[PDB]
Structures are given as structure tokens and as C-alpha cells.
Amino acid sequence: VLRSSNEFMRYAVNVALQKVQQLKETGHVSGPDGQNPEKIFQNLCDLTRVLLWRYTSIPTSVEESGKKEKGKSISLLCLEGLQKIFSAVQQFYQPKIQQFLRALVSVTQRTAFQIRQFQRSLLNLLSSQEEDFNSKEALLLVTVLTSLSKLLEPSSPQFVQMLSWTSKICKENSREDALFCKSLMNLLFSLHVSYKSPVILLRDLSQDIHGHLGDIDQDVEVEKTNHFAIVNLRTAAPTVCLLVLSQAEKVLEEVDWLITKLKGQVPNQPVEKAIIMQLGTLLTFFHELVQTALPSGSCVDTLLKDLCKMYTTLTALVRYYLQVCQSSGGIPKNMEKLVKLSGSHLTPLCYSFISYVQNKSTKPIPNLIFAIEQYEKFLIHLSKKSKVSLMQHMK
């Protein structure tokens, strides 16, 4: 009599939604014995088990309810509840996640099995090839999978398997919805960053972006789309450039702190070598990015501020070299190649991009020309105090 009802069933899970939302807002909820965490925890376990059996036993593809009930599917509401539960239990009951999952060996294998289940659920969502594209479901899936990736160690093998699967998904699936792409790239970065430096992935993204967008001169025919499938003229142009820019920004902050600590120091040699390897790769990324014909919204001024940051890092670099070149004497050949590529590829195309943003028709371009001329000034000083000419490379 109740299983025939659908309004009743969606109502009960909406009540459970109010329970979990109460808890996520507070440290507890309203109902009786809604103050002792233990009973709450147990109830959470059982609720989660019920919703798991629902969404597993019964797939998504059972809504014969109505075209309005596709976004009110019990298969969808149970997923959203699962998501909130995992968020809240990570928040509060971090010291019991193992025993929490044990009702469903380290946390690693438990997480791995649940990840198989969930990512396969998303896998059959995708291989549905559903043109309606329940992006709500897809976004809940990537959201909860992101919530769950945090419990695997960045050295655990299933962490690496997850990174593999994520890159694989980004390489096959395109799925034109910018928000799905955004959350999925955020998750893949949360993985790739925690496993190594992302600069390889950053450079591949800039290559796809240059490919899809084209160029500022509109006679540079490029399509490096093979690198990743999730790159779209609607998504990649406005959105993903901004995310990868924020990523490069964070790396620039890290290396700035590194320059600061090495300055304060005077351990030294392999540190500077790793730093300049990172910076050469970021320069390749910058070159892939700047030739692109971006939209004239915030994408262009974010690129200009990021290039200002690049010149600022180069200024601090030549500053620390001006600090050190008295004690040891000379310059590393790697730094010589670095400033060479800077003067050769970046600055002329930098001014070309300044010209391309300025011809078409306030604060950043003044800041960028200030940055590059300060870089040139400190390059004059370093060429003087390094016993080597550094403007012969320059034009």
C-alpha cells in the first residue's frame, strides 16, 4: 500500500534530508535523543545502508513517475543524502570512519570498493549516452567522489588507480556541461597535485585550449585536442583557463615562498634546480596560453595578472641571484637558458598580446609593463654583477 505511493516515499527521504541538514548546520539535531552523538552515528550507518541497497539494487532507470520526477527521483535524492552524510561524517566522526564503513582491512580498501561502486554508477550514467544528461546526478557523483578521495593516502595504490581512472575519463568523455567539467577538473587537480606537481597537466590543458580557441593572429591553425576530451569552446574558453590560472598562481606562491626561504638562508643546489625546472615548464604553459584569442571578459585580465606574477617571480629570481653571485660567483647554465627563453619567446609575444588586447576597443597592463621593465632593470644589474652579458640574448 505504501510502495505504491511515491509522494510518501520522496517525502520520507526529504525528512531524512532535513535531519542531515540539521546536523550539518549544528552539532546535533532536534529529534528525541538528538544530543548524544552515538545514537546519531548508528542511525546514520543504518540510513546509509538502506540508501545504498536502494540505489544499488534499483538503478536510476526506474522513474516511470513522470518527466517532472526525473529530477525528484528517489534514486537521485538517496544519492544527495549519501553525499551529505559523507560530508558530515568526515566533518564530525573522522575518528570512526573505518567502523562506519565496516557495516557496509584499512580504510583504503573499504574506500576502494565503495569507489568502484560509485564511479561505476557514474560510468553507466555516462555510457548511457543520455542527451538529457542528468548533470545534477553527474555533479553529485563527482562531488561525493571528491569528498571520498580525501581518505585515501596520496601514496596508496588505489589513490593512483583513481588518478588513472580520472585522467582516463577526462581523456575519453567530453560531456558538454561546463560545471560538470569544472568539478571534475577540480577533483583531478586534487588528485594530481597530491601525487606530484601538476605542471604537465597544466601544459596539456594550455595546449588543448590553444588548439580549440585558435590564436590572436587568426592564421596559427592549432588543434591539440588529443591531450584531453573535456575541452569545449563553451567550457574551455570562459571557465577552465581560469581554474588552471589559479593553479599556476598557487604554484607561483609556493616558489615565491621557496625564494624567500633560500634568501633568508644565506639544501641549496637541487632546490634551485627543481625550482627552475618548475619555472621552465610554467613558461611553456604561459607560451601555450598567451597566443590564444581569449574572450575579453575576466579571462584576458586574469592572464595579464598571471603574466605580471611570472615577471615578478623572475624579478625575485634575478634578485636572489644578485644576492648570491658575490659568494660563489657566476650563474648556473640552467638559469642562463631560463632567462634566454624568457627574453626570446615570452617578452616579444607578451608585447604582441598587450597590443592585441589594446588595439581592440586599465590597471593590469600598466602593472605588466611596470613588471617587465623592472625585470629588464634587474637583468641589467645582474648582467653587470654576474660577469656575463644578459642582453645579447635580449632584442
Binding site: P154, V193, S194, Y195, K196, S197, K250, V251, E253, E254, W257, L258, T260, K261, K263, G264, P270, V271, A274, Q278
Partner: protein, 314 residues
């Protein structure tokens, strides 16, 4: 030339009354400094006493810098042994006592001490600081001039500690390069562990320090990790400090207590959940002590008619 083990006391006692110059006193203290590695430990206190009364001439910086590096390596070696603890503590205390009298008599000594130590030359962590270093600073803050200066310094240094630490854990690439360094927090905690014995001069500043952290960075916004983690870890550290302190010190209770109560009761607007959870942990661990620390709560109930309800429930 080489000196006797027994006769370094008198060697430096002679240079006590000589008219000397910079390099004269410099070589004197450098010889007496390098002599430390061939010494019983009951011998070091009056040695350092005389080293400093001679440091009074001009030679201030190097005495402290050497004592610092000495005791730094010493405590590292002792922690690696753990991988005469009571005696080692008893030393460090009387060293710091005599360094206190010194900066009491010299209002410049502490400035160079500070200048030697301040991590915020630009902001990057120096490797100069240590448990013993910090213990000296906190035994110093009870002098009226340097107090606030020191307590600001320590605060900002802890802040940088946590900033660099959260960036580290946030980034694999940097985690690959740098070896973990004994953080300021953990430094302080171990200091508290050592404080058990006879370190009365330190606790008076520890109390203030913890409460200062809590008052400075307590939740106030809701009346984000970059903004909140430092602030939360800061108050959390203050909490841990006061907790592990209140566990063992029997003469700063009632005043830890009444301070929490004072900051709690009256304000009645800004969040004090941190104070309350702290208080909860405190009471839970060791209530029987509070049968001795009684009347503050009996009188605290008197405001209960004026207080707001939810807070009263907690």
C-alpha cells in the same frame, strides 16, 4: 692556547676586572665557549654567570648565540637518546634565571636577543629557535618592557609556522623537497612537558600566551582554510597549552579558571564556543581539583539570570 678543565672559572674571573677591547673580550669568551664541550654540568651555571657579567663590556650577542646553539644540539641529542633528564631541566632553568638578571640589568641585551631571534626578517622561518630559546623568552616576558613585544613575536611566528605547514600539506611537490622541521607548536608542547619540574617563571607567561592566542584569533566572523585554519589551530593550541598546563600546575588554577569565566560571562555577543569546549575538556579530565577551586563557579551562577539561554545550556 689550551686551558685546564678545572681552571676556566678563574681564567675568566681574571678577565673580569681587566680593561679590555672588543677583540680581547671576543677571544676570551670564544675560548671559554669552546671549553663547554669538556665540562660537568653543575659547573656551567656560574661559568655562564661570569661569561655574561663580562659580556657586559661589549660582547653580548655571541655569548647568547653560542649558549643557544649549545643547548639546541644538547636537547636534540637528548631527544635522540630518548628515541639525566631531570638534571638537564634543572640546568636550563638556572641558566635562564641568570639570563633574566642579566637583561634585568641591561635593557639592550634583550633587544639583541630579540633581533637575533626574530623570524620575521621578511617572514621565512629561521632555524634559530628552540624549546630552550622559547623558554628563555617566556621567562623574560614577565619583565615589564619586553613583554608585549615578545608575545607579539611568538604569535606571528606561530602564524607563519602554520601558514607554511598548511601550504606544505596542500602541495606534494614541496613535500617532496623539504624535510619536516620541528614546528613552533610542538616545540611549545615539549616545553610544557619539561616545565613540570621547577619552571615557575615560565607558567606566568604561558597562561597569558594561551589566553592571548584565544582572544586574538577566536571565532568572531560567524557571531575557508587560509583565514580559519591558522586562527582555529591558534586557539586550539592555546587550548592544548592551557589544558596540559592545568593538568599539572597547582598555583595558576583559579586564574586560568576565572579568566575563562570572565571572558565568557560578560561579552555575551562574540562566539565563546572555543572557551566552552576548552572548559568542558578541563572539567572532564580533573574535576576533583575544582572542589578546591570552588567559589568562582558559585559566584559565576549569579550572572546566570542575566546570561543568554543557549550559552547557559552549554
Amino acid at each position: 692556547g689550551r686551558w685546564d678543565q678545572q681552571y676556566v672559572i678563574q681564567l675568566t674571573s681574571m678577565f673580569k676586572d681587566v680593561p679590555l677591547t672588543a677583540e680581547e673580550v671576543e677571544f676570551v669568551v670564544e675560548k671559554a665557549l669552546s671549553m663547554f664541550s669538556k665540562m660537568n654540568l653543575q659547573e656551567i651555571p656560574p661559568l655562564v654567570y661570569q661569561l655574561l657579567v663580562l659580556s657586559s663590556k661589549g660582547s653580548r650577542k655571541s655569548v647568547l648565540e653560542g649558549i643557544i646553539a649549545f643547548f639546541s644540539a644538547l636537547d636534540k641529542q637528548h631527544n635522540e637518546e630518548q628515541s639525566p633528564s631531570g638534571e638537564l631541566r634543572h640546568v636550563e632553568g638556572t641558566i635562564i634565571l641568570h639570563i633574566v638578571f642579566a637583561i634585568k640589568l641591561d635593557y639592550e641585551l634583550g633587544r639583541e636577543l630579540v633581533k637575533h631571534l626574530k623570524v620575521g626578517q621578511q617572514g621565512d622561518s629561521n632555524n634559530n629557535l628552540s624549546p630552550f630559546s622559547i623558554a628563555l623568552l617566556l621567562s623574560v616576558t614577565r619583565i615589564q618592557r619586553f613583554q608585549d613585544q615578545v608575545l607579539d613575536l611568538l604569535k606571528t611566528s606561530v602564524v607563519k609556522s602554520f601558514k607554511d605547514l598548511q601550504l606544505l600539506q596542500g602541495s606534494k611537490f614541496l613535500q617532496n623537497l623539504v624535510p619536516h622541521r620541528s614546528y613552533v607548536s610542538t616545540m611549545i608542547l615539549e616545553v610544557v612537558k619539561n616545565s613540570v619540574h621547577s619552571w615557575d617563571h615560565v607558567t606566568q607567561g604561558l597562561v597569558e600566551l594561551g589566553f592571548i592566542l584565544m582572544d586574538s584569533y577566536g571565532p568572531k566572523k560567524v557571531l575557508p582554510s587560509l583565514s580559519r585554519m591558522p586562527n582555529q589551530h591558534a586557539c586550539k593550541l592555546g587550548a592544548n597549552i592551557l589544558l596540559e598546563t592545568f593538568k599539572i600546575h597547582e598555583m595558576i588554577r583559579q586564574e586560568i579558571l576565572e579568566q575563562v569565566l570572565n571572558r565568557v560571562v560578560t561579552r555575551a555577543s562574540s562566539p565563546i564556543s572555543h572557551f566552552l569546549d576548552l572548559l568542558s575538556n578541563i572539567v572532564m579530565y580533573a574535576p576533583l581539583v575544582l572542589q578546591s577551586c570552588s567559589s568562582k563557579v558559585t559566584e559565576a551562577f549569579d550572572y546566570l539570570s542575566f546570561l543568554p539561554l543557549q550559552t547557559v545550556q552549554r
